[PDB]
Design a protein around this ligand. Sequence first.
Ligand SMILES: [Zn+2]
Length: 149
Amino acid sequence: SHMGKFGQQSGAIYVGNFRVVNRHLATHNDWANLVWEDSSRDLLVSSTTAQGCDTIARCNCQTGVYYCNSRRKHYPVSFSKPSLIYVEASEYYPARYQSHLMLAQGHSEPGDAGGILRCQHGVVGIVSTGGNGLVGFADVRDLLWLDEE
Ligand SMILES: [Zn+2]
């Protein structure tokens, strides 16, 4: 019994002809094939040729399970709704307010960004931030165009 689906953990969400990755980890190839990006959400979407098997959740769940790479293990989480959160400077961004970010208590060290959070409806978001015993997930549920055709 689990608080969310187990699915692929490729470091990116694959749905329809889209690949959703942490903007700060997007590869040179992602940028050559850019569909959409938002620095304030730490999200980038690039285009693909082949159908991805993830389902994007369209719910208001505040519980789910994510994969933590540093522990090589899944954890159930309770997270706050998507909010505007102050994220201090890193090698990837200056200090700024990051929007659509969902906070939970959880392990999240550098390297853990890209871990996928799923509820029982599908993919909810992707690990983006960490620190002070918290893990922050970039929500993708509001992206209605992000789907299959
Ligand atoms: Zn849900």
